[PDB]
């Protein structure tokens, strides 16, 4: 009950996935809303799409 | 307190207002008729009628048909000296094996 | 803003989109894009405040850059073929420029930031019109030029869109930002199916437009722009919350609701072309969208949040303005799964 | 996506400008009028795939 | 009176009429699958003098 | 099947148009009538299925599940009217509407003839269940329980959708009859391994499989009584029905791919019985008993012999009835004392005699007591597993011993002993509760009388 | 775009003249009845949103909802049936014209076909 | 990118372990460079030296993961004499995950990365064997 | 019971035959449609996947300023 059901079967599948999704969501949505920053990102994306996609 | 919240109400007992309560409804007449219809339909109709209907369902699984067919085949085969259970399901003449 | 000026600006936006969708010439398509943007800026800035001004500024910068790149692609294509007709593009570099420009116009990742920023900045009516119509036009251009789309680039941008939409929507609390990230994810799905069946792209567009119209009009009806503002709606008009809950379930792709049909048809079509990894990843990633839809539904309908004291006066008063086609949008966004084979009519 | 209002109504809004072999003012010929005419005539009515092949 | 009874107990016929309609629709669905009627190798037989079909 | 589908879709307007005090009476009466009508589906053929039309068909595996669903609806109505007395009329009608929609989806799920229609319906069953749980649950954890249930089921089922559309593109049809007649062996390759995994994992999450089961205690503990009754009685049987249906096309790869699932099922059966031994909550004890029995059914389906399939079907029906009865009894106790702790209320045999009798009968059926259909199914599964290998008997014997231990432990803790002194609100049992227990228990004994009706097509 | 650009296709034509040779949908079609059901649901939702009695008020409005939905549904069904008939026609014509691509195959009975047997034990 | 992938694939699976390690290290370095470029774009550094330090850290982490993966997979296939076996790629993926955990100083990150990267690498090997394609060419 | 509620086995048998025939015809049609779509998209010689080309009615054949077109 304690070691497997309440702890490790919770940690492997549902808890780890939820933690990963929460961290990725924080990373994606934590933006300062600066046009300078995301336009520099646009420039990098344009360069990458030009060079790596033939 | 952090809210204007109602106090948790006391448990309501159906036996206090209606000593002969069946536990279905507050209104005595509705409660009595709910009991009557539930008991009648469920027990009488469903239990008795469905059980007897299932008991006397026609033998569509062909259990007795299969038993009679097996009796006939056993009689015919042991009368003529043939094996009771055939060795092959299909005909090796009609089966063509690869070279 | 004068009502006549507002209606003529809306007519000009629609005229620009229609010029894009009827033109057979690249110059006329570009003219339609320019007309749409020019008439769309004041619509964003209709209710004047610094947030609206900032949103309009960012929208203008992004759309102007996209138009410049698109015209560069048109000129490069003319250089190597001497053709102005909108068909398969004859230069791969021009095609890549066109694809990136149209992706930036649509808000596909990694060109997505402006979508949540602008949607939060502008009002509910402005956000509704933005999402719907401004997705409508570039998708038509992409459908016309579909046969020369680089599948690798298009599918990469689509998968990025789905992932980014899911994660952003997970983090957000503002309803307009939630709707923006939902739009990003749905655009990802549409452009993912784009290189295979433009009919499936159009079907996804129509279902998404119906669901978005229903959701935005429910938000306008309840006058809710945040989660907690939406949490008080059960105490004034509980029916609106029930309709919003079923619409949110539909947007998450739950069967047998209408939002399952586009996902189902797109997965089927992609699997017909021997795509399995992409449909499986796309299907699994939509669980993030469903999670934040469900989190929004818990606050509004399935649980009762605390209310305030002036809600009694709000009870005493009655809603005046009538939303146009809201019941029709709510029905079409939840109960059209049995009518699926009409996509042949849409063909 | 593409609503061919021009073809449906018999109008001409940009088809005059689509190609350089069409009617030009004062009958000024293009630089590659003959080649463009030959390619268009070859590729007419067979579709994109057969046109490219 | 009697009018109030029907005003309240007109809903008790909904399920029975639904059952009747369902039986009718089952018959209608059966009558469209009469493509191998009296044509299976196992059950093919000559029609009786006063019957048109083997089953309905 | 329309003669059964349409009366439910007529239960809807009748419920919404009936008077404020006649809703329960009308719903119960007409649900019982629909159950009586659905009893006519048990007349099956020995050769093939009942092919009603191009859309719905019935077999010896579908018929008992349909009868169980239709019989289960009125019992849920009785329990709901127990615990929803102070609700408004509109919310009562919405509750009945959710129950009716769930029953309709389950009926069409069991009678669907295509795998894709089956998928659509068996995924549509989630919405009413989620709404019921997260809306009419009592405690705080209902929201987390709904999230766990929903996302487990969907993460299982989406690869199933991809695999189904792939199989249709490959073979031309998803019709069950066609794929049974045009079945071809599955070669041992990675692609076939992953198709097998997609289908089986969807239904294993629905079962549930040990290690994929936490959503079951979460949802069953936190759902209202009707939600708990339907979740254990019927919704756990969708996974078993799906596995008994899809494994037609997964051979011979099932011979090699079943080892991890068989080991998981056997060891998790032991583990969940042991967990039941040390549970402080009654609903959690019942939920883990459900997990153990469904693990046994998974073993039966995976070993996949004609003797195992009959055992699987019999055990599914028996577990549905027994778990529903146990949940109802626990709910009556909860309504007495407003708590789920097992040791809070004791001496309920000296305070409530007939309820003690019902507890005894339900606990006796929960363990395999002959000649109950529970024992019939468990014994068939054990025999097939013995023919499979000769240490499965060791595992099954351990499981039976622990099952008896925890069932009788629950009975002794709740009923026997001395009553708690300060609990003085234990009113005499209601006729409604007693009738509910009787309607749970009598059909089980009648099924024991006639056991060939629930042994599946392989009989 | 599969059937876009098909030869002889008149632009912006919801239903061409060649669709008149197909059987029109029956007025009692289950799909038409479902369109009517959608219209009725829309009317009920309209009453609920405007806070009128859901089943009683606005009978004329509910009738208009149902009628409009049935009208558009009838025309939509006609177009859908025509498009599917067109697809079948094109597929059959292509199979007929490409016999080397769609060759008839000799049918071998199961007595001649060899299939491996995998025991279950 | 395509050239680097083609070089890695053109090196035979069971031989030239140093060449496999070099190719995988180059791929990892390019991936880390792209990630560092995006990180600098979206979260600007406080200084040029801090930006260069972050770029070096990301690039070295990626290159180390690639080198460990390539070395472990090639060595495992060579010693087991079993090319076209997903187990080699699983071992390489878990070794890369352990490298990531060591770089980030986190046992939990290391374990999760080992599991996920091992599954991903095994899936990549199975796809190479079976002809699975992520961006399928349009047809039908 | 058999007289009142149920029908003979022939009805179910022959309905099953009709259902199987319909489903087999549908499966054959689906596979054939997939093959036809694949060939038409690959080759471009059928009514489907006919992407537009420039109309030759636009070309001006009147004599130009320069003799060599
Ligand atoms: C971790 C240690 C470990 O391997 O534990 C396996 C072990 C399985 O039991 P077993 O008796 O050792 O397996 C028999 C043979 O080892 C393996 O059997 P075999 O060698 O005869 O061939 C069959 C094998 C064929 O091998 C493969 O297919 C391998 C290729 C990759 C498979 C990826 C599976 C993805 C789908 C499942 C995702 C969730 C997990 O089948 C599988 O691998 C089945 C994959 C699914 C396993 C169970 C999934 C549910 C887990 C629930 C608990 C989660 C916490 O435990 C688990 O899988 C669960 C705990 C670890 C997670
Ligand atoms: C209220 C509305 C009804 C009022 C009363 C009837 C007024 C009209 C009377 C009339 O004209 O009758 C003649 C007409 C007889 O047609 P027929 O010409 O003899 O049929 C021969 C046909 O040629 C060939 O017929 P077939 O058997 O080949 O049918 C083809 C069928 C083949 O389709 C399939 O195989 C798949 C069907 C399901 C697809 C989607 C599954 C996943 C989504 C589930 C639902 C999501 C939304 C919730 O495909 C379709 O029908 C396409 C649409 C699918 C849905 C059809 C629904 C029909 C009833 C419309 C109202 C439903 C209301 C439901 C809720 C009620 C609440 C009070 O009767 C009807 O159509 C009446 C149908 C039953 C009405 C009562 C409600 C039953 C609801 C059953 C739900 C489950 C099924
Ligand atoms: C009927 C079966 C339907 C099956 C599904 C089909 C699709 C839906 C049906 C179409 C839409 C119906 C109207 C929706 C709004 C209703 C509002 C309302 O109060 O209604 C009460 C209304 C009567 O009350 P009233 O005195 O007029 O006004 C009371 C106030 O509204 C009282 O106002 P209030 O302030 O007290 O309201 C508070 C209440 C307000 O709550 C509501 O308004 C809930 C209902 C609306 C929610 C959204 C409905 C569905 C919209 C489409 C979405 C997809 C549907 C399918 C989903 C599948 C998966 C779940 O809020 C709550 O209770 C909040 C807590 C619960 C929230 C969580 C649960 C949400 C469930 C959402 C899904 C429900 C689906 C089933 C439909 C249920 C309603 C019929 O009753 C009806 O409208 C009954 C339905 C119509 C019956 C027509 C009968 C005609 C004559 C017999 C025909 C026989 C058959 C024909 C053939 C001929 C045979 C002879
Ligand atoms: C077909 C379409 C084609 C489109 C492309 C066209 C290409 C041709 C272009 C032709 C010429 C164009 C002329 C116009 C350019 C206009 C530039 C401009 O106005 O920039 C304003 C912009 C900011 O203006 P501001 O705000 O007044 O200046 C702030 C101060 O700098 C004070 O700043 P702070 O105190 O905050 O820090 C200083 C510094 C701090 O800077 C950093 O932290 C960046 C550190 C970069 C390290 C790069 C290492 C590269 C290694 C390569 C591989 C070898 C092995 C390495 C192994 C590991 C080694 C550790 O900067 C920042 O923090 C600002 C954030 C952005 C920095 C990086 C900007 C470049 C793009 C992003 C990627 C950077 C490289 C990432 C690594 C990956 C490389 C593949 O200035 C800059 O970004 C730097 C100066 C301009 C350089 C332009 C170079 C050409 C770009 C093209
Ligand atoms: C003598 C003169 C008589 C004239 C008679 C009138 C002739 C027709 C006039 C049509 C109206 C005038 C033009 C106004 C716009 C026309 C729009 C429509 O008619 O055009 C058709 C378009 O019809 C619509 O596409 C079908 C609408 C389908 C609506 C439902 C979509 C299906 C959703 C699936 C679920 C359904 C749920 C239930 C829905 C209620 C076909 O046009 P087409 O040139 O070829 O399109 C080109 C673009 N393509 C190729 C990419 C497609
Ligand atoms: C976490 C997810 C759940 C846990 C994983 C479930 C158990 C997996 C156990 C490994 C399966 C081993 C088997 O399936 O594959 C063997 C090798 O396994 C693979 O190489 C590894 C795939 C990824 C395994 C993930 C689990 C980690 C297990 C690590 C130890 C298992 C390997 C033991 C030595 C083989 C080779 O067997 P083979 O007879 O060729 O049949 C393959 C099919 N063929 C014939 C078409 C090729
Ligand atoms: C598919 C199923 C695979 C089965 C293996 C599952 C992973 C097993 C390892 C999990 C145990 C590790 C651990 O406990 O710490 C996880 C650790 C710490 O977070 P906690 O706060 O402890 O989580 C608790 C949330 N309430 O979080 C992480 O998972 C690390 C992040 C993973 C790195 C990213 C994965 C990289 C994979 C790349 C290819 C994809
Ligand atoms: C009043 C309130 C609003 C609801 C109105 C509902 C009825 C609307 C239609 C009225 C009748 C129109 C008509 O003439 O229909 C006939 C037509 C079939 O006729 P036809 O096919 O020519 O003949 C049979 C050939 N074998 O029939 C059809 O084509 C049927 C198409 C419509 C299907 C509608 C399905 C039901 C919708 C819900 C109705 C609920 C009514 C509840 C009323 C409550 C009042 C308090």
From Swiss-Prot, chain C:
Protein name as it appears in the record: NADH-ubiquinone oxidoreductase chain 2
EC number: 7.1.1.2
Family: Belongs to the complex I subunit 2 family.
One Gene Ontology term from the biological process aspect of the record: reactive oxygen species metabolic process
GO terms, molecular function: NADH dehydrogenase (ubiquinone) activity
Enzyme class, UniProt record, top EC level: translocase
Cited function: Core subunit of the mitochondrial membrane respiratory chain NADH dehydrogenase (Complex I) which catalyzes electron transfer from NADH through the respiratory chain, using ubiquinone as an electron acceptor. Essential for the catalytic activity and assembly of complex I.
Transmembrane feature ranges: 3-23, 25-45, 59-79, 89-109, 149-169, 178-198, 200-220, 237-257, 274-294, 325-345
Source species of the chain: Sus scrofa
Reaction catalysed by this enzyme: a ubiquinone + NADH + 5 H(+)(in) = a ubiquinol + NAD(+) + 4 H(+)(out)
Membrane topology: Multi-pass membrane protein
Gene designation per UniProt: MT-ND2
Assembly and oligomerization: Core subunit of respiratory chain NADH dehydrogenase (Complex I) which is composed of 45 different subunits. Interacts with TMEM242.
Places the protein is found: Mitochondrion inner membrane
Entry keyword set: Electron transport, Membrane, Mitochondrion, Mitochondrion inner membrane, NAD, Respiratory chain, Translocase, Transmembrane, Transmembrane helix, Transport, Ubiquinone
Xref: Pfam families: NADH_dehy_S2_C, Proton_antipo_M
Gene Ontology CC annotations of this record: mitochondrial inner membrane; respiratory chain complex I
């Amino acid at each position: 009950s304690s070691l497997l059901d309440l702890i490790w079967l919770e940690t492997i599948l549902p808890k780890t996935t939820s933690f990963i999704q929460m961290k990725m969501s924080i990373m994606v949505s934590n933006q300062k809303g600066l046009i300078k920053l995301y336009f520099l990102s646009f420039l990098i994306t344009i360069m990458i799409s030009m060079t790596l996609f033939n | 307190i952090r809210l204007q919240e109602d106090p948790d109400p006391e448990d309501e007992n159906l036996y206090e207002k209606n000593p002969d309560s069946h536990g279905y409804d507050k209104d005595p007449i509705v409660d009595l008729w709910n009991m009557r219809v539930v008991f009648f339909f469920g027990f009488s109709i469903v239990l008795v009628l469905g059980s007897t209907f299932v008991a006397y369902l026609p033998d569509y699984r062909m259990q007795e048909w299969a038993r009679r067919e097996a009796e006939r085949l056993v009689k015919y085969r042991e009368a003529n000296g043939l094996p009771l259970m055939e060795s092959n399901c299909f005909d090796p003449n009609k089966i063509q094996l690869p070279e | 803003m004068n009502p006549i000026i507002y209606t003529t600006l809306i007519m000009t936006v629609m005229s620009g989109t229609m010029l894009v969708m009827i033109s057979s010439h690249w110059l006329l398509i570009w003219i339609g894009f320019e007309m749409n943007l020019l008439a769309m800026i004041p619509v964003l800035m209709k209710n004047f405040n610094p947030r609206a001004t900032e949103a309009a500024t960012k929208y203008f910068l992004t759309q102007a850059t996209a138009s410049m790149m698109l015209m560069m692609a048109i000129i490069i294509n003319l250089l190597y073929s001497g053709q102005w007709t909108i068909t398969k593009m004859f230069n791969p570099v021009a095609m890549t420029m066109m694809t990136m420009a149209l992706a930036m116009k649509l808000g596909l990742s990694p060109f997505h930031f402006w979508v949540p920023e602008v949607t939060q900045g502008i009002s509910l009516q402005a956000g509704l019109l933005l999402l719907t119509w401004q997705k409508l036009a570039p998708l038509s251009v992409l459908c016309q030029i579909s046969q020369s789309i680089n599948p690798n680039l298009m599918l990469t941008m689509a998968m990025l869109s789905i992932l980014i939409g899911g994660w952003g929507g997970l983090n957000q609390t503002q309803l307009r930002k939630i709707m923006a990230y939902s739009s990003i994810a749905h655009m990802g799905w549409m452009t993912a199916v784009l290189p295979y069946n433009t009919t499936m792209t159009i079907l996804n567009l129509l279902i998404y437009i119906t669901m978005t119209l229903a959701m935005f009009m429910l938000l306008i009806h309840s006058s809710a722009t945040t989660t907690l503002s939406l949490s008080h709606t059960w105490n004034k008009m509980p029916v609106i919350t029930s309709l919003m809950m079923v619409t949110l379930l539909s947007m998450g792709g739950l069967p047998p609701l209408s939002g399952f049909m586009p996902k189902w048809m797109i997965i089927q079509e992609m699997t017909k072309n021997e795509s399995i990894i992409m449909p499986t990843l796309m299907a699994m990633t939509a669980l993030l969208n469903l999670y934040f839809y469900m989190r929004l539904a818990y606050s509004s309908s399935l649980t009762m949040f605390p209310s305030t004291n002036n809600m009694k006066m709000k009870w005493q008063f009655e809603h005046t303005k009538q939303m146009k086609l809201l019941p029709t949008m709510i029905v079409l966004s939840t109960l059209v799964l049995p009518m699926t084979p009409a996509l042949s009519s849409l063909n | 996506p593409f609503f061919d209002v021009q073809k449906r109504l018999g109008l001409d809004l940009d088809r005059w400008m689509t190609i350089q072999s069409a009617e030009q003012p004062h009958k000024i010929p293009g630089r590659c009028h003959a080649f463009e005419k030959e390619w268009i005539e070859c590729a007419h009515g067979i579709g994109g795939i057969r046109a490219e092949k | 009176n009697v009018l109030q009874i029907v005003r309240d107990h007109w809903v008790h016929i909904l399920v029975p009429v639904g059952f009747v309609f369902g039986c009718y629709l089952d018959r209608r669905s059966d009558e469209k699958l009469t493509a191998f009627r009296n044509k299976s190798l196992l059950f093919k037989r000559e029609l009786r003098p006063n019957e048109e079909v083997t089953w309905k | 099947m329309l003669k059964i589908i349409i009366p439910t879709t007529m239960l809807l307007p009748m419920t919404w148009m009936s008077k404020h005090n006649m809703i329960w009476i009308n719903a119960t009466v007409h649900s019982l009538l629909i159950s009586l009508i659905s009893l006519s589906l048990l007349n099956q053929l020995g050769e093939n299925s009942l092919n009603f039309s191009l859309t719905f068909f019935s077999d010896s595996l579908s018929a008992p599940l349909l009868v169980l669903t239709t019989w289960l609806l009125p019992l849920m109505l009785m329990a709901s009217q127990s615990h929803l007395s102070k609700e408004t009329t509109t919310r009562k009608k919405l509750y009945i509407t959710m129950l009716i929609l769930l029953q309709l989806f389950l009926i069409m799920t069991f009678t669907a003839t295509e795998l894709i229609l089956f998928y659509i319906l068996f995924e549509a069953t989630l919405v009413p269940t989620l709404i019921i749980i997260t809306r009419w649950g009592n405690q705080t954890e209902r929201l987390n329980a709904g999230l766990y249930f929903l996302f487990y089921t969907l993460a299982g089922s989406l690869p199933l959708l991809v695999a189904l559309v792939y199989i249709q593109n490959t073979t031309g049809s998803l019709n069950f009859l066609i794929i049974h007649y045009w079945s071809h062996p599955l070669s041992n390759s990675w692609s076939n391994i992953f198709m097998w995994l997609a289908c089986i994992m969807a239904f294993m999450v629905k079962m549930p499989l040990y290690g994929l089961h936490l959503w079951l205690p979460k949802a069953h503990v936190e759902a209202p009584i009707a939600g708990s009754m339907v979740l254990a009685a019927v919704l756990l049987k969708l996974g078993g029905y799906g596995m008994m249906r899809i494994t037609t096309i997964l051979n011979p790869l099932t011979n090699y791919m079943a080892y991890p699932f068989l080991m998981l099922s056997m060891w998790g059966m032991i583990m969940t019985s042991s967990i039941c031994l040390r549970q402080t909550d009654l609903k959690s004890l019942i939920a883990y008993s459900s997990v153990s029995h469904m693990a046994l059914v998974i073993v039966a389906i995976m070993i996949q012999t004609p003797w195992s399939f009959m055992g699987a079907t019999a055990l599914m029906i028996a577990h549905g009835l027994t778990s529903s009865m146990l949940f109802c009894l626990a709910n009556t106790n909860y309504e007495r004392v407003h708590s789920r702790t097992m040791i809070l209320a004791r001496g309920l045999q000296t305070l409530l005699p007939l309820m003690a009798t019902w507890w005894l009968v339900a606990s006796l059926t929960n363990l395999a007591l002959p000649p109950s259909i529970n024992l019939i199914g468990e014994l068939f599964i054990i025999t097939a597993s013995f023919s499979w290998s000769n240490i499965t008997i060791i595992l099954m014997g351990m499981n039976m011993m622990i099952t008896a231990l925890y069932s009788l432990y629950m009975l002794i803790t709740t009923q026997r002993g001395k009553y708690t002194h300060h609990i003085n609100n234990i009113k005499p049992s209601f006729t409604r509760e007693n009738a509910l227990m009787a309607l749970h228990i009598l059909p089980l004994l009648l099924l024991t009388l006639n056991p060939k009706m629930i042994l599946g097509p392989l009989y | 775009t599969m059937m876009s650009g098909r030869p002889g296709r008149v632009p912006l034509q919801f239903l061409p003249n060649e669709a008149r040779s197909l059987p029109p949908p029956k007025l009692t079609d289950p799909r038409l009845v479902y369109m009517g059901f959608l219209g009725y649901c829309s009317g009920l939702i309209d009453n609920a949103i405007r806070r009128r009695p859901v089943v009683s008020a606005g009978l004329h409005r509910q009738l208009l909802y149902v009628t409009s939905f049935v009208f558009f549904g009838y025309y939509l069904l006609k177009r859908q049936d025509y498009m599917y008939a067109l697809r079948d026609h094109d597929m059959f014509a292509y199979v007929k014209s490409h016999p080397e691509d769609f060759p008839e195959k000799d049918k071998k009975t199961y007595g001649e076909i060899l299939e491996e047997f995998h025991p279950v034990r | 990118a395509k050239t680097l992938l083609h070089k890695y694939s053109d090196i035979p699976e069971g031989t030239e372990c140093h060449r496999k390690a070099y190719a995988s290290t180059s791929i990892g370095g390019a991936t880390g460079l792209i990630v560092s470029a995006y990180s600098i774009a979206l979260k600007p550094p406080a200084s040029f030296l801090e930006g260069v330090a972050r770029t070096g850290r990301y690039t070295f982490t990626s290159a180390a993961i690639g080198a460990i993966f390539g070395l472990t997979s090639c060595i495992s296939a060579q010693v087991r004499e079993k090319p076209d076996d997903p187990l080699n790629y699983f071992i390489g993926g878990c070794a890369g995950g352990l490298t990531l955990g060591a770089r980030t100083r986190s046992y939990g990150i290391g374990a999760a990365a080992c599991a996920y990267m091992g599954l991903t690498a095994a899936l990549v090997k199975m796809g190479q064997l079976e002809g699975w394609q992520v961006f399928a060419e349009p047809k039908v | 019971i058999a007289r009142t509620f149920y029908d003979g086995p022939e009805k179910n048998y022959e309905k099953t035959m009709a259902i199987l025939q319909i489903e087999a015809e549908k499966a054959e049609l689906r596979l054939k449609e997939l093959e036809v779509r694949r060939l038409m998209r690959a080759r471009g010689d059928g009514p489907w996947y006919q992407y537009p080309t420039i109309d030759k009615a636009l070309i001006d054949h009147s004599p130009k300023t320069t003799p060599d077109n």
